[PDB]
Design an enzyme around this catalytic site. Sequence first.
Site, PDB file in Angstrom:
ATOM      1  N   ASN A  76       6.007  -4.556   7.786  1.00 20.42           N
ATOM      2  CA  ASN A  76       5.358  -3.736   6.768  1.00 20.42           C
ATOM      3  C   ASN A  76       4.205  -2.839   7.254  1.00 20.42           C
ATOM      4  O   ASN A  76       4.245  -1.580   7.223  1.00 20.42           O
ATOM      5  CB  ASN A  76       4.798  -4.747   5.762  1.00 20.42           C
ATOM      6  CG  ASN A  76       4.043  -4.215   4.562  1.00 20.42           C
ATOM      7  OD1 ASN A  76       3.556  -5.036   3.766  1.00 20.42           O
ATOM      8  ND2 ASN A  76       3.924  -2.886   4.412  1.00 20.42           N
ATOM      9  N   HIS A 118      -0.739   3.062   8.501  1.00 23.18           N
ATOM     10  CA  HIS A 118      -1.133   1.885   7.817  1.00 23.18           C
ATOM     11  C   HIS A 118      -1.724   0.761   8.701  1.00 23.18           C
ATOM     12  O   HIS A 118      -2.688   0.118   8.331  1.00 23.18           O
ATOM     13  CB  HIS A 118       0.083   1.498   6.977  1.00 23.18           C
ATOM     14  CG  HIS A 118      -0.241   0.608   5.849  1.00 23.18           C
ATOM     15  ND1 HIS A 118       0.729   0.316   4.877  1.00 23.18           N
ATOM     16  CD2 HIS A 118      -1.409  -0.076   5.585  1.00 23.18           C
ATOM     17  CE1 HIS A 118       0.113  -0.525   4.046  1.00 23.18           C
ATOM     18  NE2 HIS A 118      -1.177  -0.776   4.441  1.00 23.18           N
ATOM     19  N   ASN A 146       8.107 -10.072  11.500  1.00 14.43           N
ATOM     20  CA  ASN A 146       8.755  -9.572  10.287  1.00 14.43           C
ATOM     21  C   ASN A 146       8.043 -10.009   9.013  1.00 14.43           C
ATOM     22  O   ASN A 146       7.263 -10.973   9.040  1.00 14.43           O
ATOM     23  CB  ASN A 146      10.267  -9.857  10.236  1.00 14.43           C
ATOM     24  CG  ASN A 146      10.495 -11.331  10.008  1.00 14.43           C
ATOM     25  OD1 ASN A 146      10.397 -12.126  10.949  1.00 14.43           O
ATOM     26  ND2 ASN A 146      10.654 -11.720   8.748  1.00 14.43           N
ATOM     27  N   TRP A 196       1.109  -9.425  -4.784  1.00 15.89           N
ATOM     28  CA  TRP A 196       0.412 -10.156  -3.763  1.00 15.89           C
ATOM     29  C   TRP A 196      -0.904 -10.658  -4.262  1.00 15.89           C
ATOM     30  O   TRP A 196      -1.880 -10.820  -3.527  1.00 15.89           O
ATOM     31  CB  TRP A 196       0.201  -9.312  -2.544  1.00 15.89           C
ATOM     32  CG  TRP A 196      -0.082  -7.910  -2.910  1.00 15.89           C
ATOM     33  CD1 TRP A 196      -1.305  -7.316  -2.939  1.00 15.89           C
ATOM     34  CD2 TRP A 196       0.887  -6.917  -3.259  1.00 15.89           C
ATOM     35  NE1 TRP A 196      -1.169  -5.983  -3.252  1.00 15.89           N
ATOM     36  CE2 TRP A 196       0.167  -5.699  -3.450  1.00 15.89           C
ATOM     37  CE3 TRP A 196       2.279  -6.932  -3.416  1.00 15.89           C
ATOM     38  CZ2 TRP A 196       0.814  -4.504  -3.813  1.00 15.89           C
ATOM     39  CZ3 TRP A 196       2.914  -5.740  -3.747  1.00 15.89           C
ATOM     40  CH2 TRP A 196       2.193  -4.540  -3.946  1.00 15.89           C
TER      41      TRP A 196
HETATM   42  C1  LIG Z   1       3.129   1.079  -1.595  1.00 17.11           C
HETATM   43  O1  LIG Z   1       3.426  -0.293  -1.727  1.00 17.11           O
HETATM   44  C2  LIG Z   1       4.763  -0.677  -1.318  1.00 17.11           C
HETATM   45  C3  LIG Z   1       4.666  -2.183  -1.361  1.00 17.11           C
HETATM   46  O2  LIG Z   1       5.958  -2.755  -1.450  1.00 17.11           O
HETATM   47  C4  LIG Z   1       5.153  -0.105   0.089  1.00 17.11           C
HETATM   48  O3  LIG Z   1       4.428  -0.758   1.170  1.00 17.11           O
HETATM   49  C5  LIG Z   1       4.866   1.403   0.147  1.00 17.11           C
HETATM   50  O4  LIG Z   1       5.186   1.974   1.449  1.00 17.11           O
HETATM   51  C6  LIG Z   1       3.388   1.586  -0.213  1.00 17.11           C
HETATM   52  F1  LIG Z   1       3.107   2.936  -0.191  1.00 17.11           F
HETATM   53 MG   LIG Z   2       3.020   0.532   4.060  1.00 19.70          MG
END
Ligand SMILES: *[C@H]1O[C@H](CO)[C@H](O)[C@H](O)[C@H]1F
Ligand SMILES: [Mg+2]
Lengths: 203, 204, 1021
Positions: free
Chosen positions: C100, C416, C595, C997
Amino acid sequence: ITDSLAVVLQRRDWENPGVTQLNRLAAHPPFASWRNSEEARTDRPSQQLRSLNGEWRFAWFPAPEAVPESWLECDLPEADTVVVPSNWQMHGYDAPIYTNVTYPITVNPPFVPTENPTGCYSLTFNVDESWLQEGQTRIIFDGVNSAFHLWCNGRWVGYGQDSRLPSEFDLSAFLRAGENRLAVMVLRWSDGSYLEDQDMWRM
Amino acid sequence: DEANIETHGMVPMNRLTDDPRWLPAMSERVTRMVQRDRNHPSVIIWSLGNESGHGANHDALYRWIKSVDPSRPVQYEGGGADTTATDIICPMYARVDEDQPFPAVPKWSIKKWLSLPGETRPLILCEYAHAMGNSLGGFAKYWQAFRQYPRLQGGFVWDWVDQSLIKYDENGNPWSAYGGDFGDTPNDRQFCMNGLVFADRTPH
Amino acid sequence: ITDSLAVVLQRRDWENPGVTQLNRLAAHPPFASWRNSEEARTDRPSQQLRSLNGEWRFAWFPAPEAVPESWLECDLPEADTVVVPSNWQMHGYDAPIYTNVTYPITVNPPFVPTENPTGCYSLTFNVDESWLQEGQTRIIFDGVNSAFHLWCNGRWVGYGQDSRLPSEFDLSAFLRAGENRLAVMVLRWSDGSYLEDQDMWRMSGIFRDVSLLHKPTTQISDFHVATRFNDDFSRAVLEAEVQMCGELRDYLRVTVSLWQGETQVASGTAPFGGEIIDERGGYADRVTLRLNVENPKLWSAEIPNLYRAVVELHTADGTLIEAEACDVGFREVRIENGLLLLNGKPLLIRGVNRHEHHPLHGQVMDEQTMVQDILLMKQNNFNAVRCSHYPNHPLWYTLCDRYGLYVVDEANIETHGMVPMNRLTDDPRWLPAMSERVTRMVQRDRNHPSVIIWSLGNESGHGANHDALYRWIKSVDPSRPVQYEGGGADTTATDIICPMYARVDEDQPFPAVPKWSIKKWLSLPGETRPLILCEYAHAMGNSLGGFAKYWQAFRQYPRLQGGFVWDWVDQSLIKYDENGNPWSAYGGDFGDTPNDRQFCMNGLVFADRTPHPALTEAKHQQQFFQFRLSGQTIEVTSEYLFRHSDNELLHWMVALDGKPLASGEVPLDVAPQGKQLIELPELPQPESAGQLWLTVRVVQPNATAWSEAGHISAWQQWRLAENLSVTLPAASHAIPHLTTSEMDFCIELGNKRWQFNRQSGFLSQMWIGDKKQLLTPLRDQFTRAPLDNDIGVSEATRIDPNAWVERWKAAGHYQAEAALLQCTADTLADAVLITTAHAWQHQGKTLFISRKTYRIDGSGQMAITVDVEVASDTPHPARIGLNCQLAQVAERVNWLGLGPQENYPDRLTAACFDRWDLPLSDMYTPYVFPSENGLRCGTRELNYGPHQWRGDFQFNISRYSQQQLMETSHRHLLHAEEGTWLNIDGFHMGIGGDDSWSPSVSAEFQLSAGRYHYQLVWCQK
Ligand SMILES: *[C@H]1O[C@H](CO)[C@H](O)[C@H](O)[C@H]1F
Ligand SMILES: [Mg+2]
Ligand SMILES: *[C@H]1O[C@H](CO)[C@H](O)[C@H](O)[C@H]1F
Ligand SMILES: [Mg+2]
Ligand SMILES: [Mg+2]
Ligand SMILES: [Mg+2]
Ligand code: NA
Ligand code: NA
Ligand code: NA
Ligand code: NA
């Protein structure tokens, strides 16, 4: 080998607005690296800072291509001793041009003319190894017009554009104790030239 | 403090400045300056460059600085001296009372310029009173105006020293040279001599 | 030689933010190079355009270095034949990674890891020499991830970065007639990678089209279109700016024509050369035309009126050099006075974020799919989509243009994982790189009417680079607003307040970047912007609880203009078992490390485009028609801004407890934003007892381009009346017979028998005839198989002690022990009465107390009464009910309650109260990651087998125990259990979803009362 002119100039970085530097460090206000507060406080001179201004060896060519591979290795026979810093037109190498608006070269960005006055500067010098042990050693060109490639001890180091700002490089990995040699190839025209059409003498 | 960018010969002048492809190059030219000089108190205004028309690259850069260094205003004359990219109206060679209404980039009398509808900025000429040769006639008109109009905050004369070079005659006699004196082509001759002082720093 | 790898890779361009391309051409809108007006005009196919998609040769290496020099020259022996485009992880070459935030590689910009999966693609092909004679030939890669070098016929050509935009090169000088060969070396990691930290599967290759374009030497290099209107849109100006490349000659001309299908609406012709722009003059090589249009037809997502525009480059004599064209939409987007308007009206965005993802093809897109998505969206009341988080495949835009969907185009930039998030964005050194990413997009997409907002990217903090870029666009394209959420959602870099996951009424006051309740956000001192959430209502798993709160607010606050749900489809991939059985995989399923597991599954639909139940809730809350009921009158309100209810039928109907008493039909005739009154015929006044309900539906009699005939677009129901039952049960001629063992109590009555175990205190078995009915005793239940939301983690790494699940666990909810406090039996005149009391404890704490009564009468009905006490200091339980495993297994399920889809307390507005009958299968929701599901609320009567239950509850029923669910990580691993599992809830906690979350269940949805009471009746037929 990849330090070879043949190779380096292959890219023709000076004809690409996309490349304005290579391995050049980041910008910042002026540093001295004092190692003593008082000194710094009183603006004394710092020993971590050393000038390379003086006599250097120079040779001029009508073009980058004309530069001979040996140059990397050895000083030329036909080289002259010159003071740095300076403008080579000021030494008779070629003419300074006084044009206002009109570009000295032909307008065809990002292309520079094939005959492009190259100036090979070289300098041999010594380095205390104390420096060579610990810390970091970089070199700084406060101004080189218009573009240039750089070697240290036969090794290709980097490239830079913008005649009015400083260029810095980490020499740390190319230095040897004692005797070192820099080879700077400087070009008249570059893609940078298109951004430098000031009404002044073109040197 | 002014960035190293002039594309005066382009056509139109902003051929490059309005091109993204050149943005990075331009960018470097500004960013770096700032990075280097920002700690000096004498620098009080940042300038994006000179005679490069007005292009989006400018706006973008203007903004950048604003964000990074809000302590100083930014100016830029290109494209009319009053664009979105300048915090100050900074024309070059605008007359005290006469308008020079060129198309697209007219130069209003400076007293008039201030009063244009919606205009609120201060005005400082980036270039005025061309000091070429026997010149500076009319200097006082400016001064007076500056003194009477609050928003007229002065200007920068163009320019300090003649850009002349020394040459020698056969008798090893030095002499002041100008455009074309080196067989340089093409050239603009005396045009490089507009100073208030001679190259040796001797006053006109 | 200088074409040598050794040489080329020497530079290591892929480890230098300073180099993002080499010899790559300039960006521009899509070209075809037609050579015939008509063709272009009708969008035929141009022959100057050729696809290189197909079989290609591929070979993989652990590193660039490992590539062998010969490769340049000759195909490899060990090469494979592969289809292009595609993602190589999709072919087994290596693993796809699902991380992520955390970067797949080590954080050390601008350095990439030494082992960097290289993919050598090669292709040999032929070229008509006609092309080789005159004109220009270039190649185009619509998408290559992440970076790459390129050779043609042994010759080095160029390099490129940015996986989401096209790369073009002039091949002109390397081509030979006949046989040519391309060699593309593609890299996994590059400095570009640092700008590509999107929460998605990390893949690679040549995933978008490859093509060839033949263009004249003197050609159209670029063009832009723009529409201007009068105050009332009664009149417009189309203004086109065209630029040419090549050599300029006074006999050159340009023509621009506008077409409305067959009709030529307007035309204009001119010679190059612009107006003075500055002291040096104008653009000799450009020209701008202005076409006037009366009463233009406007483009909207409601009605995608399009026009066709033709750009012909020709000579004065008439000879055409070439043509380009595009579809054109007349529309104005603007922000005025805090509001976002479209063609003068204030929008209401029913949006969704969508990634380019295929369960099978990975990141490779196709018409077919695209359309599918669109259709669905449209059918579910969506009107806009956000390209999270990069420019999409080109066709997309067209489709949207044609079908009618508002789009947010977004630059390919996400950092990010940086720390702080804006480490790079605030660095000049990265500015150029970033720059390219924006500029290019704009350059490419600006002519599409569906694009209405530009976005600078995503989750990259807020840095000066942003401001600069924001500005740039503003200058270049003033026609659209710009937005960007990073750094607080309200920076100087955004024209709209576009937070992600802000709550309707609650503030989340994080330091530096707090998220205010959206109603509050608007009112902050000095704030004037409109607010549209860039992300809201996290659709992960059993979610979307609370959706309606948003809708309502949106509807009540002018400046709240909607948002984009996160997100459309689950990012799941298919895998196979040994039996060659396909199954849905997620993070870590490829041994990919590190992951984030299920985290990639947040869609409203399954990867196959099969809907989750939530979709319906959405569809309903987003409907364009709103209803009010007054007396016998229905008030209808249109949320269409531009269309009239010209394909609308309103069907209504009345039923009593499911029994339909009357129905009707009425055609709608409402103007955009108008009201329509509907007079009802005298309604039936049934005597019988029950609930009287009115229901309306909106139907589309005729099909549309995105809908079938008879499509339902809206509905609503109301409870008209209630007739309480005052009747009494008739006498039984007998009464049950009690028998007391030491072990239990036996109730008999006819063939019927019930047994209560005396030590457990539960109803242990029951028979009908000689048939046992239960495999498991009936007992209280206070927990559930955790939902994604209950678990609430966004990073596999970080666990939240505050997560429901965490709390429940810690409290011992999951492992409390029941204790019989009491169990008694008694014979009444007309029945038998059982009384129990149990306590659930854990480590000496009593969490709950359950007190019941069971009463069996002569009619053979068993009435249950439950009263529960919950310790104030224990976490509110997930639910309050009972459960058991029935021995029997049947086909259908029939009930009278809310349906027909799965519905939860905080997600049941779309549901209808009626009589439903489905197959057992349908009572289960195959969430890839399994948990509590299938619930239906507000049920009064439930039928399964010979059984019947009555009361007022919620339930679920399937073949899986909660335990099984809770213990199985993938849907494919569950297996039916012995009989049928039944969960009957007196009460059940909401599901949440404001985010996944954190605890996102609103208070009104928690079981916090302390005392609960419920009742039930159980019988057989
Ligand atoms: C906004 O939140 C979602 C969470 O599932 C994703 O990470 C997107 O890329 C983020 F912009
Ligand atoms: Mg993201
Ligand atoms: C302003 O005018 C003078 C004219 O002598 C110079 O050309 C400067 O560079 C320009 F900015
Ligand atoms: Mg360059
Ligand atoms: Mg000038
Ligand atoms: Mg790079
Ligand atoms: Na004044
Ligand atoms: Na001058
Ligand atoms: Na609203
Ligand atoms: Na996610």
